[PDB]
Amino acid sequence: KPYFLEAYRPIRKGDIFLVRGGMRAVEFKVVETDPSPYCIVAPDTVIHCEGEPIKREDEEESLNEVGYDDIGGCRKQLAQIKEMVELPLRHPALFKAIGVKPPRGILLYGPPGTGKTLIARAVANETGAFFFLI
């Protein structure tokens, strides 16, 4: 109710709109909309208190995963990495269309607790590339 209030948030059936409170981030999927396809939420809509844990479908990647929005203070090097390794993953057929040598090894050095593995996992999640840890 606080979230929908003063908002008139548009919403389509199946959306995963997320709410935050009680220092926890819970996302509620709208399963059914009486009109279709989408609807505005109005304060005059009776509200429906069910609270059942329907398990998430396998195919979607949970919102639990990290992204570029979960890191701060390393914008310059983050942009460097993004521009360095954006083409070989989103455009490999290109790299087979041209004769050029891409990088095949990267080193990151800094004091511990600076967000290195976090950066690697964020980059992996944000391009769909398979991630392996050693």
Ligand X SMILES: Nc1ncnc2c1ncn2[C@@H]1O[C@H](COP(=O)(O)OP(=O)(O)O)[C@@H](O)[C@H]1O
- The footprint of its own copies (CB under 8 A) covers 22-24, 98-100
Sign of torsion over alpha carbons 126, 127, 130, 134: negative
Q: Please tell me the distance from the alpha carbon of residue 56 to that of residue 59, in angstroms, as a whole number.
A: 9
C-beta of 100 vs 134, nearer to its own copies = 100
Amino acid at 15: D
121's contact among its own copies, ligand X, none, with CB below 5 to 8 A by partner kind, is none
Q: Which does 123 bind (CB under 5 to 8 A by kind): ligand X, its own copies, none?
A: none
Q: Is 115 annotated as a binding residue?
A: yes
Instruction: Please check if 113 is assigned to a binding site.
Output: yes
Q: Tell me if 29 sits within 8 A of 16, measured CB to CB.
A: yes
Residue 37 vs 105, nearer CB to its own copies: 105
Assigned token pair, 65? 């995963």
User: Is 33 flagged in the annotation as binding?
Assistant: no
Nearer to its own copies, 51 or 99 (CB): 99
Closest CA to 30 of 15, 43, 19, 45: 15
Contacts of 12 (CB under 8 A, 6+ apart): 30, 33, 37, 38, 39
99: partner contacted, choices ligand X, its own copies, none (Cβ within 5-8 A by kind): its own copies
113 binds ligand X (CB under 6 A): yes
118 belongs to an annotated ligand binding site: yes
Annotated binding site, which residues? Answer: 112-118
User: For binding to ligand X (CB under 6 A), which residues are involved?
Assistant: 71-74, 112-118
Annotated binding site for ATP, which residues? Answer: 112-118
